[PDB]
Symmetry: C3
Subunit: 317 residues, 3 copies
């Protein structure tokens, strides 16, 4: 089954954001029994392991932008693993780690199937450039490096030598937005990027959001799709354990309809479950809750449906 054949790349990286603990994301997500869960849900799973990041001493900030040589090397080494997975014939699955690893994820994937479309589930567009960036964090700057349109506006940041924009503006849709920087709104609006903030979902409902999202992305031909889900795109009552929570976002049901719908397209070929920090929870249940939501979102992507699932065998005999 193509839609059930997966390559599990675990990326324990955190130098893209200023809070420790997001590196233990792969670990906690694996302890919840996702490998076995996907295997009990008729899946062809194979684990590639955690990618190691041999510490980079001497990594002075590029202006205000912190940890550039580390953010880059981790994405360039992951980009090699995603390409190596896609060649083995499997849907790449990147467990983060911080969302700056999306540069590597989309990059390696795009090396095999350059015609990819991107659905981005996040509260923040994460579309900042090292010049527009207000915080300096590279986890909120992945999208600027990947757009063919922003070249010339993207400066020479140490560690990003390898980067060649692989996605054009027309090939990425936003869902769940509610925390956008002024500079990010300029990029969103002036580039003409198909966005659906929380206002959009409140007006149409996730049904019409996915109706327009899969038509906008797959209108002409059925090309492969890369889903870059940052768990802060959901409401902090479902994913409380995360670096940047913003209240009033996607509900548990909403997160399941997005993933259940993209599965039915039969074109999911890359997935990212980013920004899961297990040591950023106010109580143990906020941690369990977060991982249970991130694991449920994952199973919805690879076959799980709420109406039920059955095999081609007679159950009434």
């Amino acid at each position: 089954a193509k839609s059930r054949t997966i390559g599990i790349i675990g990326a324990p990286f955190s130098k893209g954001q200023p809070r420790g603990g997001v590196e233990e994301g792969p670990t906690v997500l694996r302890k919840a029994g996702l490998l076995e869960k996907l295997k009990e849900q008729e899946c062809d799973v194979k684990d590639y392991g955690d990618l190691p990041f041999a510490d980079i001493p001497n990594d002075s900030p590029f202006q205000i932008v912190k940890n550039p040589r580390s953010v880059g090397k981790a994405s360039e080494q992951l980009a090699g693993k995603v390409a190596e997975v896609k060649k083995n014939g499997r849907i790449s699955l990147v467990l983060g780690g911080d969302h700056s690893l999306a540069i590597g994820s989309i990059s390696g994937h795009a090396r095999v199937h350059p015609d990819l479309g991107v659905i981005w589930v996040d509260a923040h567009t994460d579309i900042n450039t090292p010049l527009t960036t207000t915080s300096g964090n590279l986890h909120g700057q992945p999208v600027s490096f990947l757009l063919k349109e922003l070249k010339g506006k993207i400066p020479d940041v140490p560690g990003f030598s390898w980067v060649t924009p692989c996605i054009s503006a027309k090939d990425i849709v936003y869902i769940g937005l509610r925390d956008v920087d002024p500079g990010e709104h300029y990029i969103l609006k002036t580039l003409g990027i198909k966005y659906f903030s929380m206002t959009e979902v409140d007006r149409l409902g996730i049904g019409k959001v996915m109706e327009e999202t899969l038509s906008y992305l797959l209108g002409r031909k059925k090309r492969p799709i890369h889903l870059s889900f940052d768990v802060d795109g959901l409401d902090p009552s479902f994913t409380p354990a995360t670096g940047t929570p913003v209240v009033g976002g996607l509900t548990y049901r909403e997160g399941l309809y997005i993933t259940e719908e993209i599965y039915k397209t039969g074109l999911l070929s890359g997935l990212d479950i980013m920004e899961v920090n297990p040591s950023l929870g106010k109580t143990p249940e906020e941690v369990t809750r977060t991982v249970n939501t991130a694991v449920a979102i994952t199973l919805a992507c690879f076959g799980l449906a709420r109406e039920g699932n059955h095999k081609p065998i007679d159950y009434l005999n």
Copy 2:
């Protein structure tokens, strides 16, 4: 009126599942003044009573199915009293208890009104047969015994000799589904049954779920509606005190929107308020919350409109 004339049945029985305290559902709902409140909403109310359940010594299982004679005679006791209430020109209001009681509830109702239409608001389909069951719980098997299409596909289980199936596959709608077993999903597809799982609610909104449902059950002509309401159909953040709770489901608002709509037709003729377990509270407020949600649902079945209610008199006089 024929919509506010009620026959209050109590059903203190829990032997349909492995978690005790659900036999204390008819007690607690009555403590929270369910009857006092209905008479205020201008309801002609009668109390038939909380049914006494004959204690079967040594209830040997039928294969992996636990307590078959107890469920078999408790539902047979209900059927006789449901037929009585329905024949006394009254709308049955069963207070459970577990869902295995829907055998006698629907059977009793179809003796007076054989053209009955069933709306099942519940997280589970409960359509397992005594062979396709895996949990062995009889609260997950009613719809199978009740269905005519499964004749020959149900074995001789002790206590169900009196059982004459009375519903057709096209005489039932599902609303809330999210925890389905392969065998249960299989029968739903191979029997052409109309199901609205959480995916369908997330897609179409509770307005179109209630739109599609009523135009479907009352197609060619007007007929009587039997709403079997399990409080787990709603999210366990509104109904925690329940046996098999599943996260991210029907809201306290959607559950009300469904019930308000069946009242507006004036054809609700059979009601089941199932799976209320006050012994499954984790703070006395979660029982108080589950029981408040149960009374809000029922009051809405008899005209408790959220837009307002008034007597047919001049109020500016």
Copy 3:
């Protein structure tokens, strides 16, 4: 932008209801940083201070209606300040306080912009007369005092000597209602008032709720809109520290979309955030959650979008 020039008036008035603490509403709304967050949002924020509401001891009640002289005095004082703000080209931002002050705000707004249409976002209709009312609390009687059609159904009550009904029973739309008295529902129907109870918000989504609200009042002409908002309209899970909390109301995201589509018109002239009682939250966090949501409600009515908000400059320079 004229939908950015603001005038702040803070009513520490609480004698319109039994629960004490609603008088500290504008002070807690000032510590949170209302003016500061608006100035960032590019607003012309000029404070008009706090109103000096004198004590009226021995204020005898009129029938079941308590503190009538004090309420009429408070709104008469507010009608004159709201008028000065309206005459200076500023949006009247009134910070309550209880919902009785909506007599003074809407009258003060009708003295300058008399062709205004109202949107009552509440959990209750607030349309009780000094006779029909069952509580005798004036924070639930403002609308009927302002209706021209109910000229003759309001008796001579001490303090409201100045009152002349300014709005018609057609220049108003209700939203989020789920606790409407029999007398309140009688007025709503035998007057034909546009309403969006919680039943319609569940039926048509908040998107079609706003197309139907905004068309019903802004069809023929681009007329001034006054939003008399009560935090009890939003579910007690979002604004819990309020006097009359009603479960199953508007969410954070529905209350944000409402205020977002109202800014988009550019016809907002008045705004009233009412009933934030900081002494009515079980935990200190419940107080914070009621206030943060009120701030989020206000800021959305003056430009704050979820998609982003940039200035008219080139972010790539």
